Amino acid sequence: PAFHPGELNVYSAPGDVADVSRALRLTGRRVMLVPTMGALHEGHLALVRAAKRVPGSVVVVSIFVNPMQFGAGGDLDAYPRTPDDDLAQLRAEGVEIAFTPTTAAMYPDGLRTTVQPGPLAAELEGGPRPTHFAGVLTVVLKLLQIVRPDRVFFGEKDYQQLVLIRQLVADFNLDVAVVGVPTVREADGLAMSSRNRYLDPAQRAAAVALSAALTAAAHAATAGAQAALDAARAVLDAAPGVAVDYLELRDIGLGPMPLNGSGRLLVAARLGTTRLLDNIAIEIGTF
Amino acid sequence: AIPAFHPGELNVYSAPGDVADVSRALRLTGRRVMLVPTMGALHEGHLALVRAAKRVPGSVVVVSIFVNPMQTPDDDLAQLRAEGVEIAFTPTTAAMYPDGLRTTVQPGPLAAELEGGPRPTHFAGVLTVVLKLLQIVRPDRVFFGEKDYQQLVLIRQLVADFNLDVAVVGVPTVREADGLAMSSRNRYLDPAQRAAAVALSAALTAAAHAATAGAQAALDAARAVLDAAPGVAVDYLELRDIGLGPMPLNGSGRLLVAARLGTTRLLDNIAIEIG
Ligand SMILES: COc1ccc2[nH]ccc2c1
Numbered sequence: 001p002a003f004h005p006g007e008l009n010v011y012s013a014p015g016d017v018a019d020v021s022r023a024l025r026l027t028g029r030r031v032m033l034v035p036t037m038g039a040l041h042e043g044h045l046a047l048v049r050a051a052k053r054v055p056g057s058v059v060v061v062s063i064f065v066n067p068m069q070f071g072a073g074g075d076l077d078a079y080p081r082t083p084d085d086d087l088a089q090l091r092a093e094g095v096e097i098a099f100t101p102t103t104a105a106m107y108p109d110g111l112r113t114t115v116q117p118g119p120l121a122a123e124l125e126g127g128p129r130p131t132h133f134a135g136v137l138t139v140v141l142k143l144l145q146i147v148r149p150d151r152v153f154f155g156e157k158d159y160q161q162l163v164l165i166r167q168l169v170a171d172f173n174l175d176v177a178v179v180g181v182p183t184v185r186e187a188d189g190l191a192m193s194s195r196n197r198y199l200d201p202a203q204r205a206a207a208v209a210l211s212a213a214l215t216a217a218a219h220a221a222t223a224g225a226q227a228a229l230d231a232a233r234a235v236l237d238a239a240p241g242v243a244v245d246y247l248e249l250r251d252i253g254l255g256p257m258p259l260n261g262s263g264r265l266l267v268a269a270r271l272g273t274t275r276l277l278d279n280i281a282i283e284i285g286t287f
Numbered sequence: 288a289i290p291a292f293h294p295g296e297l298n299v300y301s302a303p304g305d306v307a308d309v310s311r312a313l314r315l316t317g318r319r320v321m322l323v324p325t326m327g328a329l330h331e332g333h334l335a336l337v338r339a340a341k342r343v344p345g346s347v348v349v350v351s352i353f354v355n356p357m358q359t360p361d362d363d364l365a366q367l368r369a370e371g372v373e374i375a376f377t378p379t380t381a382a383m384y385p386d387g388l389r390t391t392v393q394p395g396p397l398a399a400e401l402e403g404g405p406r407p408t409h410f411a412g413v414l415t416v417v418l419k420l421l422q423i424v425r426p427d428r429v430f431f432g433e434k435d436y437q438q439l440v441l442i443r444q445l446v447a448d449f450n451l452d453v454a455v456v457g458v459p460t461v462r463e464a465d466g467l468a469m470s471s472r473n474r475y476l477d478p479a480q481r482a483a484a485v486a487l488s489a490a491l492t493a494a495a496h497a498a499t500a501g502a503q504a505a506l507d508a509a510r511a512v513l514d515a516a517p518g519v520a521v522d523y524l525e526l527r528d529i530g531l532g533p534m535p536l537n538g539s540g541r542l543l544v545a546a547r548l549g550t551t552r553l554l555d556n557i558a559i560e561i562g
């Protein structure tokens with residue numbers, strides 16, 4: 001396959017991007033991978049920019065709405081698809097490679113061999129969606145094998161996902177650096193998300209409560225965990241039509257260890273039918 | 288700094304990071320890295336894998352020795368020196384699983400069939416450790432015996448399904464003079480059992496030649512030979528396609544058998560061509 005430097009090259013065939021990546025790597029360039037499901041926003045662009053600043057980088061952005069990480073009807077069909085906007089954004093950002101595989105190219109044998117995540121996948125986001133993270137980790141493993149990047153970039157917004165990807169990389173001895181990039185926010189604090197488009201004006205106004213609650217908690221935390229959680233709860237309680245699914249303060253690895261001084265506070269809430277996530281670093285007893 | 292590597296000698300590494308760094312360095316110097324995964328206690332079957340790896344031009348051979356809990360140290364290393372193997376990778380359980388069992392590989396449904404009957408989690412263990420070894424060593428080719436044919440097929444599923452950039456090489460089964468497939472378990476057989484054990488290979492070779500008369504003739508011939516043996520408890524005798532799906536009307540297939548002799552479980556298999 002041809003590679004035209006300094007412009008966007010789009011490859012659909014896994015073999016094509018694998019060949020181009022291999023060839024680039026062999027000439028000294030360092031391959032950076034930003035895996036996405038399209039519907040690109042400023043959060044994704046932050047990832048692209050982080051990747052682009054690595055000296056000698058060539059940036060590969062994958063766009064693939066992975067059916068394996070969705071449960072039956074109708075989340076997969078409802079996922080936003082804005083391909084023309086996505087590719088326009090990548091061109092504007094100076095990205096040289098977009099990898100846009102088909103479902104058939106990624107899953108020619110259906111679901112056969114898959115990744116089984118550790119117990120974290122059953123908690124928080126995985127509670128009512130027990131197969132979700134197996135879908136995520138299976139596709140990320142495949143993308144890593146196809147592209148063979150030196151570094152792979154993920155937002156901190158989906159923090160549990162990022163932790164599970166670090167687990168994947170450690171547990172399977174993958175030779176890639178996982179880079180977590182801090183959450184990009186709207187001016188009022190709202191975390192970037194492709195689901196923000198489903199907030200009507202009232203819901204958009206109310207949605208500020210998630211980030212306001214988290215940031216209140218982070219500052220309250222000088223007074224301890226209870227104070228932090230209660231400050232967040234108070235802000236969420238004050239918000240019209242925010243229905244909290246969970247609000248949890250955990251150790252930074254979200255694993256089988258108690259909170260000791262460095263934590264992550266995670267929230268998920270519904271505004272109408274729209275489920276929003278956010279999270280923040282918490283230091284306990286630290287001003 | 289890359290760990291020391293002495294060309295033409297057996298270099299032994301226990302740390303995953305060490306063998307990873309050495310393998311990477313060697314492939315940059317124009318070597319082709321060949322991986323032979325084993326659980327030690329090496330026999331002539333393993334040596335055939337080693338010789339197959341060695342004959343690839345540019346080869347450097349990595350033999351891993353790891354008893355994988357999820358599925359003779361000095362003597363093994365001496366055998367490898369004698370074969371001209373340059374790398375042995377001998378990690379501890381703690382080095383392979385520093386965080387315990389966490390993320391694992393879930394095989395497809397083939398893993399529940401045949402050998403997966405008595406050992407329903409066996410292949411998950413095998414695929415998980417093989418994936419890790421492939422990521423640590425990053426070989427150009429990886430070598431497995433055909434004797435554990437279902438294992439080999441599941442490894443080919445792993446490689447295809449996860450888009451791994453490695454060639455899987457199956458090596459024809461090494462056999463004792465009477466046909467018994469090589470295995471560390473053969474020495475456990477008493478004389479009566481050892482004599483009866485020849486029935487597995489004899490049944491398969493009979494079937495392979497009976498196959499000109501069709502699938503049923505092949506299966507019936509194999510069953511007759513097993514039926515002539517005392518103390519051979521057949522767990523299965525199945526004719527499948529080469530990927531272990533259902534056998535087609537004509538074409539290539541594989542005939543697999545497993546049996547228990549006393550407390551010792553033996554496996555064997557053979558290529559079958561129908562008609
Ligand atoms: C870097 O900040 C962000 C924020 C939200 C995001 N959603 C998906 C990636 C991502 C990144």
Ligand SMILES: COc1ccc2[nH]ccc2c1
Nearest residue numbers: 332432434459460461469
């Ligand atoms: C290539 O022949 C063989 C025969 C039996 C085997 N057992 C484990 C590896 C192996 C290889």
